[PDB]
Symmetry: D2
Subunit: 384 residues, 4 copies
Amino acid sequence: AAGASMQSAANITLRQILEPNNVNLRSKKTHIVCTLGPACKSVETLVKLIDAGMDICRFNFSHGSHEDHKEMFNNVLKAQELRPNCLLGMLLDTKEKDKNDILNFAIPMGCNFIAASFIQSADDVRLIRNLLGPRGRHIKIIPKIENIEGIIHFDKILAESDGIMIARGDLGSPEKVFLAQKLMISKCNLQGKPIITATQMLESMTKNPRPTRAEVTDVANAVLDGTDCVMLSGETAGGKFPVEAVTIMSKICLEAEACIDYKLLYQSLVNAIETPISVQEAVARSAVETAESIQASLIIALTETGYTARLIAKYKPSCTILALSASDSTVKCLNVHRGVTCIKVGSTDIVIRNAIEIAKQRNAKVGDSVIAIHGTNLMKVVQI
Amino acid sequence: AAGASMQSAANITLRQILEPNVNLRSKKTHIVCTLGPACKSVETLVKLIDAGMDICRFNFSHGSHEDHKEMFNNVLKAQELRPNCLLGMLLDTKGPEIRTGFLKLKLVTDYEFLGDETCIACSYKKLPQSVKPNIILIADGSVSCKVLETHEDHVITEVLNAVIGERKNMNLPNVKVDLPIISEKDKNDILNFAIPMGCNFIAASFIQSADDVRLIRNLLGPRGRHIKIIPKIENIEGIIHFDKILAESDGIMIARGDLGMEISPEKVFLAQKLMISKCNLQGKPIITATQMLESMTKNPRPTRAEVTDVANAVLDGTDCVMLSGETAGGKFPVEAVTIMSKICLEAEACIDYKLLYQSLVNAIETPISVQEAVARSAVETAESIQASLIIALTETGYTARLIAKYKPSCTILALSASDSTVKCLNVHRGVTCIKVGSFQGTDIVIRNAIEIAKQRNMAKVGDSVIAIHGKEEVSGGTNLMKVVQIE
Amino acid sequence: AAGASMQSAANITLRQILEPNVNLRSKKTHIVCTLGPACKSVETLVKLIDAGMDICRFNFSHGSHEDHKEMFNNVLKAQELRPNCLLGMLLDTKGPEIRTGFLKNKEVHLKEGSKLKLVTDYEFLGDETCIACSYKKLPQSVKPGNIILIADGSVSCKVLETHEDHVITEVLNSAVIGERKNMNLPNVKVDLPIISEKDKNDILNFAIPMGCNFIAASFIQSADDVRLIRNLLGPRGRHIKIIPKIENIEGIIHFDKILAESDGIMIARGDLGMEISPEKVFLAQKLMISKCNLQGKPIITATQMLESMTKNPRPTRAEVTDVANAVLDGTDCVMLSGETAGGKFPVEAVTIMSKICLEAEACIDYKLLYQSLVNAITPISVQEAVARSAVETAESIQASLIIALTETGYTARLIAKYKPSCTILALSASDSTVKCLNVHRGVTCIKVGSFQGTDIVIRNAIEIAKQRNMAKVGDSVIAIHGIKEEVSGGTNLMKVVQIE
Amino acid sequence: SMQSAANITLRQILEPNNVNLRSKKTHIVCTLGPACKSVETLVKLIDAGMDICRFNSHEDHKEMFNNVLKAQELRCLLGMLLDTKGPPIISEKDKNDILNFAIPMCNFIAASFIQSADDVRLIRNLLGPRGRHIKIIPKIENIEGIIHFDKILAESDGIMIARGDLGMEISPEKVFLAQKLMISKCNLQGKPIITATQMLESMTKNPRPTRAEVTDVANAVLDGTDCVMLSGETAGKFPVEAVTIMSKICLEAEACIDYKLLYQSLVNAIETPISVQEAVARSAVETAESIQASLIIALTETGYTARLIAKYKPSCTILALSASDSTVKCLNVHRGVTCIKVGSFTDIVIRNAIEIAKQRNMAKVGDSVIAIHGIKTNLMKVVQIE
């Protein structure tokens, strides 16, 4: 749906298939959620995952105690202390009984995402929003869907939620198992909410170094379906090869992303989105359109709330999106959106000039055009 | 690429997920079934027909001519029992292979050497000349060896990764295997089974160039002129020379496991997506031979991952899907086809046929013939008036192939007097065939076909139908497009 | 609207501007010629045919039935000399008129400040202060604030007061006017019979028995006028086409309803823009031509665009580009009035008309024309979808002709609506069909015999096309036949043939 | 377009157009003569919609020039155009007019009989560094001019067409083609084009034009002309009512243009690769359409920025803001551009233009406005009117 066109697939070169592409693993547009576990216990193993393209850290609260999860949360902070340029996001998976693991464990530790289990209505997401309160106003709520009633109210749930998480095993007639995956991802894509595909795609990586040919295909299809994120479960938690699993994920994502017809993807989006778009959203459209027209390397989005960056991400430009924010809660929450890499800033040329030097160091190159957007609404085009 | 759009996927209704219903044979994607002991019964073959079998694959890696002849005749008995359905006959060749030697690392060309773990023999006597200090795969790509030293009858390698058996499979990435495609057995299989028995397709194994296909066409000759040649792409050389192979071929067969031998594991879907799109653009039929429901061998229901694998193959734009061990030597063969057909149908309801057509039209070579121009008209008009059926009057199958190329949303009803044509057009998706007595006229044949179509509930009273007749591939004829109300 | 695009206009070659030699009857836009003394002879009529005349117009505002009968036969004699040409016959009705009265000195000089009284006593010998009006219902049809135009809009008068038997006005501009001059009443529905007994005599005792194809009806104000004329024609006049002339504001207001009942439209700038403010006249013309194009209804541009060619052998530059723009607006026909009827150079007027038409037609972007038609027309019949396929395939393979087999003209009308780049060859056994399709641009006809199958008639039409240099060996041709034309459920056929 | 014209309303046809005459997109060139003499009638010509004054005794033109600036000070920047006599490429009378009158005083110079791209260079040489700001607009009066048009247009600032001139050597049936050819070529290049063809000559003696003359100017506007010209009408018994009618026709024809189509036709036909600044100019136009902006405000020094926006023909008015008198008076040949002179020494400049736009009826409170500035780096600002 958000993948290759007839023309895009037929233009796949021999160099893409025969010769391994050499690119920075974190330059990938699709983002990776790793479930932290006993194999991730080591700080040396956590930094290895970051270099292998880890973007979001999952803390599965359905097993274990708070005191052991505090040890992981402290460990990943030390791992993030080692690599200053990169920044991670923290997600907590739920299992009433998890209310003490939400009100006390998530609020104090400062998680970014809440994976609320077995949500059935739009009323349910208001309850988890009320329990969080003003102190938990920055924590994003992500409904997981395992129940048929949740699919029936999916539109009403999507509208209030901060993005949804979907797993193939949770949804289960066996013939119509892929339909749900494709329907929901596309509906999220149009609404602009980020989608996490939780399905364990690489269950072979738990014991074997390289995955089966069918599992590779499965991952590629999910990227081409239009998912923002993918998830490793047993591969990272209790597997023999956790680092090589994330490395393979980023490799497949980068390879699948090379097939995407971004021109078609934009047109598909513009044609389907509701008739009346706001003034701010119109400028965001121009930014993407201009980025494609001049083949720019970056779109720098200056935002505080993370709203402006969330507008660029909806229309999915081919180039990288660089979000610049003063809020450290913003720069960690935007990891849920694909094609978004964010940098924390202090307080026009103030942050844009510094962004170009930082992107050149994380090579972006000299002689490139860059699009800057700030929201009342501004759009700058500067040479590198 | 031939799948769902943003809007198509967003418009998936709860009635698709929850409720089920349609006839199994009304599906667009066609199913190839590998025959064996599990479905050897005359009763069980009929059950597969009703489940959605379109082409029968005769795997000639195992079994004798006598074994396959009985299997051939059993299917003909099922053809007698099911008069409406008309199945295609595919013969898959064993082809060339490279094997390891015997055992009681260096690789010697002397195949008599019973060696230790220090030295093992190889079947390919031209290995020293063919390989340069390149990787060598053994035991179905389980053990990997890197070539460092080359000599007159020796090859010195270092084991990169287990314990392997004797006479095991070998692969050579990025080198052209200098072994004949038609082995003395294959030559016998084609001349003494394929032709005399009246097979429709030959799935040629390990096709490396267009010359290989020509070599097979010359062997078939006048007696086997109506048999289609379907190359199997299996090595890197097959990928490199794919275009020229495709142009000479009658269709393409692909198994993910075989392509995933010489190519880095992460890049398997690339070779698939590329070839299916190019086959679509050329209007050449493509068969995904990948075993995608291997659990059905021992399980009544497939994996959730197996289902979406089949669905994505359909949405990639494949004409055919294939069951291998599921139908040949599995506990649940009837259940395998039934689930295959079901997955196809639900996936087909996701296709955005308008976008499919538009992307085809934009990407196909700049100048087209008058015949193809009318074929586009037929498809465009069918979509415009939401016709139930495109009836294609064809002798060679050409006119039907032109319509199929442009992937209409409605079923294509191909009509022919040639038995070969009716069986051959099975490789193209969305095509159902009816054998007809030699064309008495345009009006006569069309009218009689609609009667046959009404009796099968393919159309309804009041539906519009598009008839097309071309004379055929010869330039400068007359082309008819006829729109009729079925009432 | 149906003209040159950005690309087409920039693609105008130097050859087009400098190098002149195509057959004049090869053009797409059709010509209506007004008949009169200047073209009474069979020899002239034949020369006009060669120059590109398609419809002959009979102006029944003057002349006996006998005079027109002689004219009708002379064109019939011309027809026999040019069997490749099948001419349409149009009758122009007199219709309602409103006029000033007689004057004491046969002329008066009306002045700006002066107040003028208009009386309903048509026997009153008028002067500078008081003039009679033939429309007896004037005082009750007019209110203070209305405008009254005298002598083809030379003098404007603003109504100040209305009484039982007269009206009081103020002359908005100064001019000298003569006796018995035409009047107009902007924003007023003129309550007069659409056809008088004379118009009734012309229709029943000339149009019908002479076999005219069109009646151009003067001063249509509602769809009821069109219905009133159809009833009069009756079963005997069933095949005669009604072409309303829009000549006032009421006709513009109710244009849509009028068009729906119509078989076509005839507009002339001078009359249509009479009650319209000078700057807004082109607006009405673009609106109505576009609306006709979209509906498939033919339109006739009747404005005299080559007036100076009454005296001169060559037109002014302004006159040429005016004709050009009319074609590019998307008019089906252009009309010559005084140029052919009572002018010194009638053959020459038609000759350059065709030449301008050929020149402007070379500018049209047909692809843009087709698209914007399809984008503006919502659900359509199977017959119309097949008509679309025919036009699209013709564009795709670059066919020389679309051959349309048609008994009523329906199928030919369907195709013509989609304005293909190639000529439409219409085949009919019906003599009225063949002479009626003349109002549609790009349609030319052959009368055919009784064909049992499509095969024979198409093949015979191709050999005639070869003879007439409409197609050549190697060209592709598209043939279309609809068994039951305007009736759903039949079989529709599109057939592509390569010429041997 | 088919749709645009079929949407022509009864209001458009029956009710008078009450827009301000200076708010029109098509700009008017008026030739100056005895009828224009007085300062009173010349101000009334400005209010009627005059944008460029054409000068066609040396001291006699100086009388008009000073009386024009007196009228301009009494009221809005007017362009000044000088029209050469011509027939020997450059005349001695023309060389004396260019050097001692045109350079000494005007923004545009209309050269006579240009047949190659070397003639425009020759006139550019004669102008020198003092004539750097003066725009050269060749008149096409012969076949060779039409033959090398592409080479001539590329070197020139703009083109001036007369139907009487080009149709003197051309065949009668062909005369209309040359007008449509060159107008489109200019449009696709962004060079302004003046149609000099006298099209309302009846207004010399009559207070109303003939209906034929009306559609002629109407079609010129619809051909895509940047400017229209009055010759004898202004230089005539009714000069004021001739400009008034000329303005009203322009507004009436401008209401028929399918702008979405025009933009699309432009983009599809322009040369494949475009500069970064031109792409930003495209966006400003596309964004103005998407949110129905009342104005595109272009902050430009050389006029180049306003010329890019003018090339893509947006539906809304273009406000060009410049510190240069030269460019403010030079952008008048371009369609739909009204200019304001600002102080030499961006936030206040944008805020100031919006205030004038409220008073000019061009924009209202609550409307969105698009501002564009290119230093070379390139900016686009969307602001709501408060």
